[PDB]
């Protein structure tokens, strides 16, 4: 929190669950959000919504 360690846990005390695993070495065991993959599409959506709203 605020880029300082406020707590620590063993494998016994905390679960981690990931749906979209990767073998990629630099993935470092983290997942992969569809929000990351689709981010361009979400931005394009937001822009087209703002465009249509800005008529009014």
């Amino acid at each position: 929190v605020d880029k300082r360690v406020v707590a620590s846990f063993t494998s016994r005390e905390l679960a981690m669950g990931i749906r979209n695993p990767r073998t990629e070495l630099s993935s470092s065991g983290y997942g992969l959000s569809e929000v990351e993959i689709a981010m361009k599409e979400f931005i394009a959506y937001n822009n087209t919504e703002s465009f249509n709203d800005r008529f009014f």
Partner: protein, 56 residues
């Protein structure tokens, strides 16, 4: 990959062509007022002798 996608040419015409300096600060007047989402619904007023747009 290689084409000209250019929609058309905006022909502005008067007794003589603008200097390059005049034309580049007209480009600044244009982009600061009309580009992107920020400019998206504004209309320029221009008082040239004649204005034409050629569809290519």
């Amino acid at each position: 990959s290689h084409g000209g996608t250019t929609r058309g040419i905006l022909q502005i015409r008067s007794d003589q062509q603008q200097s390059q300096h005049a034309l580049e600060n007209f480009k600044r007047e244009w982009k600061s007022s009309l580009s992107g989402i920020n400019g998206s619904w504004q209309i320029p007023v221009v008082m040239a002798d004649d204005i034409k747009f050629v569809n290519m």
